[PDB]
Structure formats: C-alpha cells, structure tokens
Curated annotation (Swiss-Prot), chain A:
HAMAP family to which the protein is assigned, alphabetical: Ribosomal_uL29
Entry-linked PANTHER family: 60S RIBOSOMAL PROTEIN L35/50S RIBOSOMAL PROTEIN L29, LARGE RIBOSOMAL SUBUNIT PROTEIN UL29C
Native organism taxonomy: Bacteria, Pseudomonadati, Pseudomonadota, Gammaproteobacteria, Enterobacterales
Gene designation: rpmC
Keyword Iron-sulfur attached: no
Protein name: Large ribosomal subunit protein uL29
GO cellular component labels: cytoplasm; cytosolic large ribosomal subunit
Disruption phenotype: Cells missing both S17 and L29 grow very slowly and have a rather unstable temperature-sensitive phenotype.
From Swiss-Prot, chain B:
Alphabetic keyword roster: Ribonucleoprotein, Ribosomal protein, RNA-binding, rRNA-binding
HAMAP family xrefs: Ribosomal_uL23_B
Organism this protein belongs to: Escherichia coli (strain K12)
Cellular compartments per GO CC: cytoplasm; cytosolic large ribosomal subunit
Entry function: One of the early assembly proteins, it binds 23S rRNA; is essential for growth. One of the proteins that surround the polypeptide exit tunnel on the outside of the subunit. Acts as the docking site for trigger factor for Ffh binding to the ribosome (SRP54) and to nascent polypeptide chains.
Gene3D superfamilies membership: 3.30.70.330
Transferase as UniProt keyword: no
Molecular-function GO terms, alphabetical: rRNA binding; structural constituent of ribosome
Pfam families: Ribosomal_L23
Listed name of the protein: Large ribosomal subunit protein uL23
UniProtKB/Swiss-Prot annotation, chain C:
Subunit structure and binding partners: Part of the 50S ribosomal subunit.
Keywords: Ribonucleoprotein, Ribosomal protein, RNA-binding, rRNA-binding
Gene it is expressed from: rpmB
Name of the protein in question: Large ribosomal subunit protein bL28
Keyword RNA-binding included in the entry's annotation: yes
Gene Ontology molecular-function annotations: rRNA binding; structural constituent of ribosome
Family designation: Belongs to the bacterial ribosomal protein bL28 family.
GO cellular component, one term: cytosol
A Pfam family recorded for this sequence: Ribosomal_L28
Disulfide links within the chain: none
Provenance organism: Escherichia coli (strain K12)
The keyword Ribosomal protein appears for this protein: yes
Record Gene3D superfamilies: Ribosomal protein L28/L24 (2.30.170.40)
Membrane-crossing residue ranges in chain numbering: none
From Swiss-Prot, chain E:
Keyword Cytoplasm (UniProt): no
Protein name, entry field: Large ribosomal subunit protein uL24
Highest taxon of source: Bacteria
Gene that encodes the chain: rplX
Organism: Escherichia coli (strain K12)
InterPro entries xrefs: KOW, Rib_uL2_dom2, Ribosomal_uL24, Ribosomal_uL24_CS, Ribosomal_uL24_KOW, Translation_prot_SH3-like_sf
Length: 62, 93, 77, 46, 102
RNA sequence: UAAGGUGAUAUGAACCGUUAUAACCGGCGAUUUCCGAAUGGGGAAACCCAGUGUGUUUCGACACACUAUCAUUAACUGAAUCCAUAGGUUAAUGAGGCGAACCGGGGGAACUGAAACAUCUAAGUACCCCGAGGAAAAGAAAUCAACCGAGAUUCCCCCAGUAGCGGCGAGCGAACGGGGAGCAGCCCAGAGCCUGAAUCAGUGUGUGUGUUAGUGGAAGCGUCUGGAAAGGCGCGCGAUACAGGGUGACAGCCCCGUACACAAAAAUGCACAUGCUGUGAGCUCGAUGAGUAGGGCGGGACACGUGGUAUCCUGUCUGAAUAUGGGGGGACCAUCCUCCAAGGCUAAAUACUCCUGACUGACCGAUAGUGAACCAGUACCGUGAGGGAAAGGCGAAAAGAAC
RNA sequence: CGAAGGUGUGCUGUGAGGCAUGCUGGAGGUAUCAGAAGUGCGAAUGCUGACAUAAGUAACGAUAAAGCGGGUGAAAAGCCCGCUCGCCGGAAGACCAAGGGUUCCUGUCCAACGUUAAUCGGGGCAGGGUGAGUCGACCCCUAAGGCGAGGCCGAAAGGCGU
C-alpha cells in the first residue's frame, strides 16, 4: 500500500476507510468470541487505517 | 446524533458468563462490552446497524478493574463499560 | 503603593540609631499627597499621588511636560 | 478513645488537594519541590 | 557488515567441538550462532499435560559464540577471515587468505 | 543500513523479510485523548455545565471550530455635560507558565565571635521576592597621578595582613604603584550641504566548515596441560593500529575495535561571498544634559564605627555658576596640575553547568560509591509541609535436574 | 602442576609480624626499592546486620457454654450436616450516611497470614457479580464562608473588595 493508496482520490480513500473499520470491527468480534486464529490481522488492518488517515490528512491540508 | 465511524468504534466485544446466558435465554438481552465513552443511545444505534436487530432498551454499568499485589508493588486492571441490550421479541443474531 | 508619580520617590530602609548607637531597622517614607492639578491644555483636573518635591518639579517643568513624561512611561493618569 | 484522624474526603481535598496547593504561591512552591524530588503522587488524588 | 551469516559453512576454533565443520542454522542478536551438529546438549525436557506431552531427554544444538567460529574456505580447506569491499555498487565479503569474493 | 525481524520481565502464538517500503539508525513531516499556565464558565486535577457559528442518503441530538485575562495598536460605538473625555464592543500583534547553576536589583535574620554583653562580629551571609542573558553587571574620565606622566571597563598576580578602621577590644582591612589576560570604541542633546556612502539587525541563495545517521580499517599456526587456551613451548606475521572491551583461564594477528582514510538526501550552528527590507556615512556651521551640582537634617555606602573626615547614594527641607565657567587633588585656604557631572550604547579577557559528545583518575567497589548498581523518591510513615529504607553474583553454556 | 580469601601445621623474629606447607577454594597476586593515605578498635547507654539469654517460662484478648451422631480429609475440639444446650433481643437484630475499596459470590489451594489444628477464612490464585426518566449525585437556588474583571491599598511577594 501507501504508493497504491496515494493514487486513489479522496472520495475513494474515505470509502476504503469505511471497509477497513467494518473489517476491524469483525476481526475484533472474531477474536472476542474466540474464533480468530490469525492474530496478526488485527495489527495489519489497524496499521493500514493509519496510512489511509495519514494520506487523507496530507491531501486535505497540502 | 450518530456517524458510521463512531458506531463501529463503540461496540467492542460480547461478554460470556452464566448471567449473560440466563439474560439471553430468559429475557432476550445481549450482554456486551462497549467503549467507556459510549452513551446508551450510541449502543442502541450500533446494535441496530451492525447486528441488524430491533433494540428495545439499553442499560449500562461501569465495572471497576480488580487490583492485584506482587509484593511491594501493585497492579490495577482496566475499568470497562458493560451494556445490557434488550431486544424486541423477534430474536436473531 | 507609596510612590511619587513624578520623581519616583519610594520608601527606603535605614536604621533608628540610638544614643548608645543601637540600630533598629526603619523606613524613610516619602512626603506623599494626592493633589488635583489644572490641565488647561486638556480642560480637565488631574489628581496625582505626588511628593512635596514632586510638586516643586511640576512648578518648574510645567504640568504639561510632567504629564508628557507620564505618557512616555506608559503610566496612566 | 476518639483518635486524631477522622477522615472526610471533602475536607482532605478542600485542604491538601491539587487545586488547593495551586491556589497559593507557597502551595505552588510545594508542587515544585515534589516534582523536583521526583514524587510519584504530588497530592492525594483520585 | 556481518562477517558470518545464515547457512554459511563454518569451522569451530574454540571449545569441545574445535575443528568440526557445519552449516550456520540461525544467528542471534546476542552475538551467538546455532551451527548444525555443533555444541549439542542432552536436555531433560519436562512433561507438559497441555499437549499431554511426554517428557524426554532431548538432544539439540546449543548456540556457540560467533567469535568461536571462523568462515570455512572450502577452496583452501582452511579457516579464514572475512574482509569487506565494493564489487560494483554492492558491498561484498572476501577471504583474507586468497583475496577471493564469497 | 541490512539478512534477519515484531521494546523488557518473557516464553509461546500468529506472522513479517533476505538485494531491497522486514527490522534497525538519523533528518523532516502527520497524528497527539484528558489534566495541568490551562485560557468559554465552574471545579474537591485528570470532571461538571454553556454561548455563537457550522455539518446531518437521520438535518432531533451528537460531531467540529471558536469564545480567558492584561498590554499596545486599529476600527466602530459612546455618558454625567454642548463639544470632549471616561466608558463599551470587535479585530490584530505580544505576554502569561516551567526550569540546574552563574548574574543584576528589592528586602534581610540569628545562632555564633567579643571566653558575660549592648557599640562591634557573624554578614549584606542564610532566606524571601523581582528581572534578565549566553553570560550578566560594568564601561570610554567632572579618573588617577604629581609638576614626570598615565589614559574605558572586566579579570589574574603583587603592593600587604602594610596604611588605616576599631568598646584602638574581638575583629574588619584598602589604595597609589608595579607585573599580566584581554583590548575598541561610539552615538544623541540640530540645521544645512551632499543623499542612501561606513556599521548593524531581520531575511533568500551559494560556498567552506561543524552538529544530527554512517563506510572501509592490517596481521596465526603447530604443540602441552586442560571441560575449555587467550596460559607453557616452538616457529611465523602486522603495527601511523600493543587505547580499551568481549570470547569456555591471561589474545596485537577469533570478534567488536583502535591508528588512519572517508561520508549526508534532509534539518540546523557558525563564518565569509551575494541579494534585499529597515537603519544611516562624509563635510561645514552650531549645540554641550537644573529642581541638577552645592547646602541643613536623618540614614545608608566607601577597609575608614563622625571622627580633624574628603568622595558616593538620598528620606526630608532647600538651591547655583553656565568654559572670563565648573568638579577633583582625603577637614579648610591659596597656588599649580588635571578633568568636564546632571543623556545613552558597546565585543574580548571574567562566572556557571539541568544538559550533549569524547577522553581521564595513586576516586568508591554493594554497611563503600548517589537516598537509589536491583521497577527508588519505591515500599512504608505522617492530616500535611515532609520523612524515607532494605535488597547485587548458579554455570563456559540452562545443559535449570527426563525417569 | 592452583592466585586472593578461608582453615590446620611447622619453622622464625624482642614484637607488631614474616616464611613454608596440608586441607578448602578456583583467578588472581605481586619481590625489591620508592611514592601516597578513607592505614590498624573492645569499650563512645557508639552505627548497621546477625545470633544468644531469661524459657520452651508469661501469654493465646471479655467467665454467653458447650454435648453427641454423621460427613470431607493425610489428618477434625474448631470446617460441613443433623439433634440438643446456652447467650443478645431499644441488640450482640435490620437499615442508612461517613470512611473503606472487592473485603461480595463461585471454584480451587494451605507456604506465609489466622496468637492453636485447620479440610475453614475478610488468606493465595482464577472466574463471575453492581443494569434506574421517577433512589442518590450531577442540575436550578441560595447560607456561613471562599474566590473575585475593573477597583482601593501595600518595598516586592501580597492584603482587601464591586
Ligand atoms: Mg446506571
Ligand atoms: Mg524518522
Ligand atoms: Mg476550561
Ligand atoms: Mg479555570
Ligand atoms: Mg455553572
Ligand atoms: Mg456627549
Ligand atoms: Mg517567564
Ligand atoms: Mg559571646
Ligand atoms: Mg533566556
Ligand atoms: Mg550588558
Ligand atoms: Mg600635562
Ligand atoms: Mg578581603
Ligand atoms: Mg597594572
Ligand atoms: Mg596585550
Ligand atoms: Mg579489523
Ligand atoms: Mg577459571
Ligand atoms: Mg557636559
Ligand atoms: Mg582627636
Ligand atoms: Mg560633584
Ligand atoms: Mg555620560
Ligand atoms: Mg556529560
Ligand atoms: Mg548503598
Ligand atoms: Mg559482598
Ligand atoms: Mg587486593
Ligand atoms: Mg600476600
Ligand atoms: Mg612502601
Ligand atoms: Mg568489632
Ligand atoms: Mg579502649
Ligand atoms: Mg506448655
Ligand atoms: Mg522462671
Ligand atoms: Mg509458672
Ligand atoms: Mg499460663
Ligand atoms: Mg479468644
Ligand atoms: Mg497438618
Ligand atoms: Mg483480594
Ligand atoms: Mg466470603
Ligand atoms: Mg497455623
Ligand atoms: Mg478470599
Ligand atoms: Mg428500564
Ligand atoms: Mg484585579
Ligand atoms: Mg477577595
């Protein structure tokens, strides 16, 4: 990501971000009920949402 | 009132125990761990949108984290918000 | 505070020297009086916390000059 | 018999609290020495 | 600038297994190296009921100090020393003996 | 910069990465809840409650931004009272608070010393308060000297425990002059002529250089004892490197280093070069700091305790001369010498160490050395200000003892 | 092929001491001559730590009071169950506020803690448990009192107050 995300328009980033949070909620909901085997996914989604929001902030006020 | 980014961050995990069971099987109430900052309205909203079910009423309570001693030094578990979400008679999940 | 708006005369410390030369700390307060002065140029009366020396300064320099200094100090009147 | 310490949290905070120390210059001088000594709790807080 | 790397043929200079040759299994932060078939230990591994796991005297390669191994110059059949240089736009290693790249 | 990684106790899990978005290191950005100057109002810190303005495939409530005080400036507005001034509102810019020592100022003890004690000492110390900077303060003679002369200030060594001061007691204690570190001079008190000409600060660019990551970095083998070799023995080799550390016992040649040789995309310190906004150079003719100098009174400061006591500061009362003039030369007068007060600025030598890097010690080695080698300003004590510990070592390797 | 330290021995010096050596230990010590001192301990009701003594002595915290059968357990006067007995009953019962902060409940464990045993516990460990329009707080309102734009006053710090 980061280069692949830098491309996409603001309207697009915000859409992807909604899916990221929707995924984050489900993955929380998985491990929560004791069903998530792939622990490392929680970290991934979280660190990706960060990139999105860093890119959104660099696009909006620059 | 609400937003999608917030409704997603609000619900955190479901809470299991013999009371969270009898609550479910005898009164159609789902016991949940919600964000400490989550209002009763924000839980109704999130449980209706993210779980697609009809919420009757939400009752909330804040649980105090237990303190454990390790000799001279102590530790304190985090404080959390428990949410009793009753649902209208058409039970699902 | 016991301060002359004109000269800047303030209380000083010294000693009460007895006949047996014993010294006990004391203050030497200035001769302060609040006095209304006539500003022809401003068509108003200005009250100033001034020393008796201060008055003699206003009598020489001229009220208009002395107030000019007060503006230059930021010291409102 | 009745001992010297009779607790009242309203009183405790209204007397030794952070806000209390913060009010006076000498109370501000207290917080200073505690921070300088490296105190864990500067005042009895929540 | 790491003289000994993963899956290198080395040769022991110090300790019980001095002279033995081996392939570098794993390298650790500690400045130590687990080398295949060197410095082995007969561990009395305790049983774990959460696997229902039996206990057993297990033999495993225990880490030797990276200063106790030298790089093996297969061509000279001798222990050697690594030196760095820039062949092209990339840094390389070479045997201090034959001045030849690895 | 890399072949290994996802901080520690602390494994395990699930994974990431190996020739270049794994990780790690450095520059610059993004984010940065709540409390705290804390600043929308309140408050028992980490909470409670608003106003205005915006947003609502829901335009309820929630989300978001703004809203403290003071100072200067600006715009509008505006009384007693006609003008005016006060007041009122908004906006812009600045301040606030924290913090080692050094520094300048405002206040200012006592215990003690005098073998008692009051003058005197301690001491302008301790402490409280205010303000500021990489230093601060001081600073270009109304200064000394002595009829020869010197030439701002700060600082060092002498002069000298001398001259003096002193219930002439206890004590306090200079200067002149000499040897040094360092050296630097200027502006206003106003007008014209020439005009932006010397200096300096803010700032863009460039170079040189320094900081914030880094790169390369020589030369060993046999044998003996031994669990193990760096130790014994034998023979080689490097050294602008034999500083130091680690490695299974003591290593120049196993590792990290060390001498030496290099390095920055970016941020920045300091210099010059250069551009620019602002400041003003040179010359002629002037001008030359007044409630001031001096004095009475009460104090304070000078090594100098009122003394025969100059010099300085001023609480109080008073008060000149104006270069044919005035200050000083330790009561005072005369002569002579010297200087020009009542306006300001100024680098260096000097003081310091919360902090960053390098190196060092006839300093300590766990009752020592920091209170603290260790999760210590902790545990614990106390209403609180505050007080305040004990506590290091298996082994080369956990092979931490299967059965 | 065994350093320092530890502990025996022997020889030696007038002595402080010195030397050698057995055992322990397991990496360090340092002649000689110089140089420098945190340089020698029995006392200071010395400081710190350790361990004696009295002594297996005094006590075991209200004189309301116990007895038995059964149980669990390695073990039972104390725990559980049962039947008796006794004590409080304007309290020794029930409920609040202040204060405490998980002590509540379940499982499990017994080193230490409990003045004894402990299977039991307010003890260890783990898990669970506190649900409000109408009960309390927040909120509106004020009291004593506090703070207080401007303000008045005060060497500074500050004091007072619209
Ligand atoms: Mg509730
Ligand atoms: Mg970075
Ligand atoms: Mg606020
Ligand atoms: Mg406030
Ligand atoms: Mg309010
Ligand atoms: Mg009018
Ligand atoms: Mg400040
Ligand atoms: Mg005396
Ligand atoms: Mg500063
Ligand atoms: Mg200065
Ligand atoms: Mg002359
Ligand atoms: Mg002196
Ligand atoms: Mg001289
Ligand atoms: Mg010179
Ligand atoms: Mg090398
Ligand atoms: Mg050894
Ligand atoms: Mg003059
Ligand atoms: Mg006389
Ligand atoms: Mg004079
Ligand atoms: Mg002058
Ligand atoms: Mg340092
Ligand atoms: Mg210590
Ligand atoms: Mg020891
Ligand atoms: Mg020694
Ligand atoms: Mg010896
Ligand atoms: Mg000697
Ligand atoms: Mg002794
Ligand atoms: Mg004795
Ligand atoms: Mg007995
Ligand atoms: Mg007896
Ligand atoms: Mg007896
Ligand atoms: Mg008895
Ligand atoms: Mg009893
Ligand atoms: Mg027993
Ligand atoms: Mg507990
Ligand atoms: Mg219980
Ligand atoms: Mg017991
Ligand atoms: Mg318990
Ligand atoms: Mg309800
Ligand atoms: Mg005020
Ligand atoms: Mg007040």
């Amino acid at each position: 990501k980061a280069k692949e995300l830098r491309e996409k328009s603001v309207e697009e980033l915000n859409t992807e971000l909604l899916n990221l949070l929707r995924e984050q909620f489900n993955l929380r909901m998985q491990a929560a009920s004791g069903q998530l085997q792939q622990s490392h996914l929680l970290k991934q989604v979280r660190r990706d949402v960060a990139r999105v929001k860093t890119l959104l902030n660099e696009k909006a006020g620059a | 009132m609400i937003r999608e980014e917030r409704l997603l961050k609000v619900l955190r995990a479901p809470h299991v125990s013999e009371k969270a069971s009898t609550a479910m099987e005898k009164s159609n109430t789902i016991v949940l761990k919600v964000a400490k900052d989550a209002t009763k309205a924000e839980i109704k909203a999130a449980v209706q949108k993210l779980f697609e079910v009809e919420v009757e009423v939400v009752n909330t309570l804040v649980v105090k984290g237990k303190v454990k001693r390790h000799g001279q030094r102590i530790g304190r578990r985090s404080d959390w918000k428990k949410a009793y979400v009753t649902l209208k008679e058409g039970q699902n999940l | 505070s016991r301060v002359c708006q004109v000269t800047g005369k303030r209380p000083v410390t010294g000693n009460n020297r007895s006949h047996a030369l014993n010294a006990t700390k004391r203050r030497f307060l200035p001769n302060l009086h609040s006095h209304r002065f006539w500003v022809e140029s401003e068509k108003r009366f200005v009250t100033l916390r001034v020393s008796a020396k201060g008055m003699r300064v206003i009598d020489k320099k001229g009220i208009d000059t002395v107030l000019a200094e007060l503006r230059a100090r930021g010291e409102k009147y | 018999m009745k001992r010297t310490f009779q607790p009242s949290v309203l009183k405790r905070n209204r007397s030794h609290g952070f806000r209390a120390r913060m009010a006076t210059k000498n109370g501000r001088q207290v917080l200073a020495r505690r921070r300088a000594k490296g105190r864990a709790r500067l005042t009895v807080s929540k | 600038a790491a003289k000994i790397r993963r899956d290198d043929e080395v040769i022991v200079l110090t300790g019980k297994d001095k002279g033995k040759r081996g392939k570098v299994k794993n390298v650790l932060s500690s400045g130590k190296v687990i080398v295949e078939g060197i410095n082995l230990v007969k561990k009395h591994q305790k049983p774990v009921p959460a696997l229902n796991q039996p206990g057993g005297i297990v033999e495993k390669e225990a880490a030797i100090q990276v200063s106790n191994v030298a790089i093996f110059n297969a061509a000279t059949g001798k222990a050697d020393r690594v030196g760095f240089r820039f062949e092209d736009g990339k840094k390389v290693r070479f045997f201090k003996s034959n001045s030849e790249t690895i």
